[PDB]
Structure formats: structure tokens, C-alpha cells
Write a protein that binds this ligand. Structure first.
Ligand SMILES: CC(C)(COP(=O)(O)OP(=O)(O)OC[C@H]1O[C@@H](n2cnc3c(N)ncnc32)[C@H](O)[C@@H]1OP(=O)(O)O)[C@@H](O)C(=O)NCCC(=O)NCCSSCCO
Ligand SMILES: CC(C)(COP(=O)(O)OP(=O)(O)OC[C@H]1O[C@@H](n2cnc3c(N)ncnc32)[C@H](O)[C@@H]1OP(=O)(O)O)[C@@H](O)C(=O)NCCC(=O)NCCSSCCO
Lengths: 305, 305
């Protein structure tokens, strides 16, 4: 009685689209792809990520057909397909990075055996020096803190079938970009771009306009704040514990101080960014994975149109 | 030495992509599709619109393949394809409406014989009453003067394979929407949406996100002002001449007054709208037809990626 471009699913419903897709991941390999605080088990990989993987390959061939028509039209000469670009977006601490890692492993282990790369956009973040100069240290993560010009070049270069294309490297440990570090990407079959900012749209063409498929990992804003604070507290004995950690001073905080500090940074930087720039981007993602307070994925929204 | 998602053409180059596409339009039929002030001849239809028509059908099949994958995935039941939506955008008086009419006739006369409809977005303009109430009479044509909610419904409804979907009707003569008038669209093979506003992007999903192909008819902003003023002067003896014309008072203007009036409305309403909302939309169109001062199409920009 009122059409929608979306189709909504239940884990029970989605679970059924797996068909007879092979589970090529061990419980040992899954654990190494897992992020701090993530609750993902093989059952979810089976129940949720397998159908998603199937759907994606179905479309990788169908999309390769499209560029064929434009090629047949322009009447140009291949054997090297157009890379299939996938964008993964989500809030900080919502688990998008884990989702991206699983998705890569799952896709790379497919009969025809593709070359699946994964690049995180934080490598296109301006160096801390440039941020201070632009007065954006307090806005790290916002669309302005990234070198969107460079990011666009990279993706354009890769999808154009460039032989070699490389990107800068970000160190979460040093909270800055690594001097002289490069991530090289040579003609991949599927490139996964993961970032807070990736689904952004605008006046000029943007990276989002070059995606062939996009995932938005969603959760309740109040639940993410919890995951964030939790992770923060747990990093006192892991990352912050390292002397080279930029936030080594946090390691000594007490459960009490830590929760305060964590909440401050959240409502001050991460929350505004989520509400203002990331969330407004959800409507356009191809697939939206809605997570529950327990980190469990129980609802899925697919773009049929 | 720096990739781009576009490919630029010369009329000579583009002219060559026609291959052996049949010219099924008479010089008599072309004239009836022509707009006041337009200089389009069969040569241009042959030289420019024929390759474009070929390219479009190439992609209509390739795109139908894509929805097939999503269908095979969801494992649903067809014989009635997903309508192929084409958006045509451009400034007022740039000729987009003529371009749209030619494109429709050209496409509808193709071997397999498709059902090609054409809807103009001005029918989704709020009635003059609603505009006055919202204080937008001076902003007729801007994105806010349209009922984007209704427009989105319509297109969504049609692409969903709706049996019947209908739209309101706008009268250029009465400068308002016709009471009780409906344009009915029954499961078309290709729906062409033509409007100033169609390529607009935003926070939520928009009509532009549902297009499968888009044309942007471009020209020099200074040349359009000329075409506009010219047309205005010529409408004194055509449209404005009719007693029922909302702008019947303009028919009596002298060449002098008319040019003044025309220029006022231009720099006041149409130009701002062009610069502010329409032009910023060009980068995203699939095909950009650049017209020359003589109304001739001499350059084409295609989105390869
Ligand atoms: C730098 C930036 C923009 C990075 O955004 P991301 O999208 O990468 O954040 P996300 O939550 O997805 O983190 C991705 C990975 O990066 C890890 N990570 C994040 N921050 C740090 C860190 N400081 N040290 C070590 N690892 C970190 C995080 O644990 C994930 O690892 P795994 O999934 O393998 O377990 C963001 O963390 C930031 O700094 N935002 C504003 C300032 C801020 O939040 N400062 C607090 C610093 S201590 S708190 C925990 C990280 O926010
Ligand atoms: C109503 C609106 C938004 C319509 O925008 P459109 O995109 O349809 O304009 P566009 O230039 O593409 O016109 C499309 C057709 O609509 C015709 N047309 C435009 N205005 C009128 C009119 N007032 N009376 C009769 N026909 C008209 C025009 O000649 C085209 O016909 P053909 O291609 O078959 O020869 C626009 O004309 C408008 O009113 N804009 C702001 C106010 C304004 O410009 N007022 C001046 C009124 S007299 S001047 C000539 C039309 O601007």
C-alpha cells in the first residue's frame, strides 16, 4: 500500500538465503580477524555473512556485464575486469573494521579465487601536523580531516585498471600517519574501502559514486557509546599499555577517570560526527546490518531498487 | 598521467559510434518534436542522438541483468522487466525538453519495440496557491517549490513494477497545475524524467538515486541567458498572445521593455537557481551534452566509471 526501495529481513529469513555456500573459515581464523570487544562467532558468519557473500558475488558478475556494454559501445579492445568496489561505513567502535575483515576473507575464498584487497580510509587522514595547522585536532574523523582529493584519486586510479596504485599508512598506535609507509594495490578483483566517511555525497563526484556495493553497520547510538566506553577501559591494559602509545597516559587512569574521559571524547567528537555526518548517510547504503546491544546482528535492510 | 571517471568526445568522434543504427525519424516528425528556438535537424539526430540511443539500449539489457542477480538471490519468482529510468536535467531554456522528446521517439522505435513514457517534473510543482502560502512564488523552479515527497513516491512506485502509477499535470499556459488532470503510467519499459531539479542529491534517498542513466544538457550560462531572452521576445506572438495566458500582459511589451523584463526574471530567479542548484549537479550526470551558442551540440562528456 506504499512501495519502498528497501526490503527488510529477520535473521531467520536472511539465514535461509545461504543456500549451499561453503563455510571456508575455521574458528581459529575467525578469532584472528576479530576486534577488541566484538562478539562474532562462526554461527553469525554462517547465518549472516554467508548469504551476504553469496549476494555480492552474484552482483560482481552482473556488474562486470554493465562495463562490458559501455566498452562494446566505445568499441574499445580484455582479461582484467573492472575492480568491484565495496564501501563499508559505520560509527567508531560499531565494528565496521571487523565486518570488513571477515568480508574480505569470506570473499577471497571463492572457487574462482579472487584477488580481494582492503584499504582503510584513515590512511587518508591529514597528518597531525597538517591537522594542527588547520585547527582540526578536535575534529579528527570529520569529513574535513581527510584528504578527499587524494582518496578520490586513489579509488579512481584503481577502478581505471591502474597497474599499481598505492595509499598512505595510518598508525593507530602513534595516532598519526607513518612516514614513508605505503599500501600498494595491484589490479584487485574486489577492493573494500572501510571508513567512517566513505558513504558521503556532495556537489562533485565522490568516492561513494564509485562504489558498486555498500554496507552500513548500524546500532543504537546509545549502545555504541557503551561499546566505545567499554573498549576504552579495556585498552588500558592493551594498546595504551605500550610506551609508544600516543595515549599511554590513559593506561594509568582508574575505572572511574577512564569512564569520564571516554564519555567526554564521545559526546564531544565521535557522537557529533556520527549524528551530523555518518548517520545521514545510512539511507543510501546497499545493505544495512543492524546490531543489537549484545553486538548481535538481528535485522538487515537491503536496497532492492 | 592522472585518470578521470570521464571520457570526452568530439562530434566527429561521437558521430562514429552510430554503427549501423537505423534513422527512423522523418524530417516532418522531428519538426513536431522541436521546441521554440531549437535548431535541431536530422543531421544532429543522426550524428549525436543515434549513438546515444545505441548506448542506452546496450545498457538497458545489461542493467536488467543486475536486478536479475538481486532477484535470484532473494530467490523470488518474470516477464515484466524493471523499468529503465532516465533522467534529463538542464537549465530553463537550454533545450532539455526537446532533447527529452527526441530521445523518447528515438528509443520507442527500436526493433524489440519498447513502451517508452516521458514525465516532466514540473507536474510535481506545488500549486500557485501552496506557493503563495509558502512564500515561494519568486522561487518557482527551486528544489523547494517541488513536492519531492510525491515525486519520489511516483518514481519508486513505477520502478517497483506498479501496474498503474499516475502524476499531476502542469499547464505552462495557465502557469499552474491543472485541477483534476492525471498522467497515467502503466508498467513502461523505459521512463524518462525531465526536469530542472532531477539530478539533485541529499541526505535521504532521492529520485536521482533511482536513475539508471542521466543526461545533462549544458551550455554557456551567458548563451542560455540569450536563448531565454530571445524565446521570451518570441512568445509575445505565440503563447502570451493567447488571452488565457497567465503572462498575456507581456504580449503588448515592446522589444525594449520585453528585453528588460526578460533579463530581470533571469538574473533574479532562473540564473541563481542554475548556478546554485542545477550546475552543481552536472558532475554526476552519465552523459553531458555541451551545446554551442548556435544551439549545436559539439562536445560530449561520458562517465566511464
Ligand atoms: C583515529 C580515528 C578517527 C579512527 O577511526 P576508526 O574508524 O578507525 O575507529 P574504529 O573504532 O573503527 O577503530 C578501528 C580499529 O582501530 C583500533 N583503534 C582505535 N583507536 C586506537 C588507538 N588509539 N590505539 C590502538 N588502536 C586503536 C580499534 O580498536 C579497531 O581495531 P580492531 O577492530 O582490530 O580491534 C578515531 O579513533 C579517533 O581518534 N577519533 C577522534 C578522537 C578519539 O576518539 N580519541 C580517543 C583516543 S583513545 S579511544 C578508542 C578509539 O577511539
Ligand atoms: C515554470 C518553470 C519552472 C518551468 O521550467 P521548465 O524546465 O519547464 O522550463 P523550460 O525552459 O524547459 O520550458 C519547457 C517548455 O515549456 C515552455 N514554456 C515555458 N514557459 C512557458 C509559458 N509561460 N507559456 C507557455 N509555454 C512555456 C517552453 O517553451 C518549453 O516548450 P518547448 O520546448 O515545447 O518549445 C519556469 O518556466 C518558470 O516559470 N521559472 C521561473 C519564473 C519565470 O521564468 N517566469 C517567466 C515567465 S514568461 S518566460 C519563458 C519561460 O520561462
Amino acid at each position: 500500500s506504499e512501495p519502498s526501495p528497501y526490503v527488510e529481513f529477520d535473521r531467520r529469513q536472511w539465514r535461509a538465503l545461504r543456500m549451499s555456500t561453503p563455510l571456508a573459515l575455521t574458528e581459529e581464523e575467525l578469532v584472528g580477524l576479530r576486534g577488541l570487544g566484538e562478539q562474532i562467532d562462526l554461527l553469525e558468519v554462517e547465518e549472516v555473512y554467508l548469504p551476504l557473500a553469496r549476494l555480492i558475488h552474484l552482483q560482481v558478475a552482473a556488474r562486470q556485464r554493465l562495463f562490458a556494454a559501455t566498452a562494446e559501445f566505445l568499441g574499445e579492445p580484455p582479461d582484467r575486469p573492472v575492480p568491484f568496489i565495496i564501501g563499508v561505513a559505520g560509527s567508531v567502535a560499531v565494528g565496521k573494521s571487523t565486518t570488513a575483515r571477515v568480508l574480505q576473507a569470506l570473499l577471497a575464498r571463492w572457487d574462482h579465487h579472487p584477488r580481494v584487497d582492503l584499504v582503510t580510509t584513515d590512511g587518508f587522514l591529514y597528518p597531525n601536523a597538517e591537522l594542527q595547522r588547520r585547527n582540526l585536532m578536535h575534529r579528527k574523523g570529520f569529513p574535513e580531516s581527510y584528504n578527499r582529493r587524494a582518496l578520490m584519486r586513489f579509488v579512481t586510479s584503481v577502478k581505471s585498471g591502474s597497474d599499481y596504485a598505492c595509499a598512505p599508512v595510518y598508525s593507530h598506535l602513534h595516532y598519526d600517519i607513518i612516514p614513508g609507509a605505503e599500501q600498494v594495490v595491484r589490479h584487485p578483483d574486489i577492493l573494500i574501502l572501510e571508513g567512517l566517511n566513505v558513504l558521503q555525497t556532495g556537489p562533485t563526484l565522490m568516492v561513494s559514486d564509485l562504489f558498486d556495493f555498500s554496507l552500513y553497520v548500524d546500532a543504537r547510538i546509545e549502545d555504541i557509546e557503551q561499546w566505545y566506553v567499554s573498549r576504552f577501559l579495556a585498552m588500558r591494559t592493551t594498546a595504551f599499555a605500550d610506551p609508544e602509545s600516543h595515549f599511554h597516559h590513559y593506561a594509568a587512569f582508574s575505572d572511574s577517570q577512564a569512564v569520564v574521559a571516554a564519555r567526554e571524547i564521545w559526546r564531544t567528537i565521535n557522537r557529533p560526527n556520527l549524528v551530523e555526518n555518518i548517520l545521514p548517510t545510512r539511507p543510501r547504503a546497499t545493505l544495512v546490518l543492524r546490531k543489537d546491544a549484545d553486538h548481535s546482528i538481528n535485522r538487515l535492510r537491503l536496497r532492492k531498487l
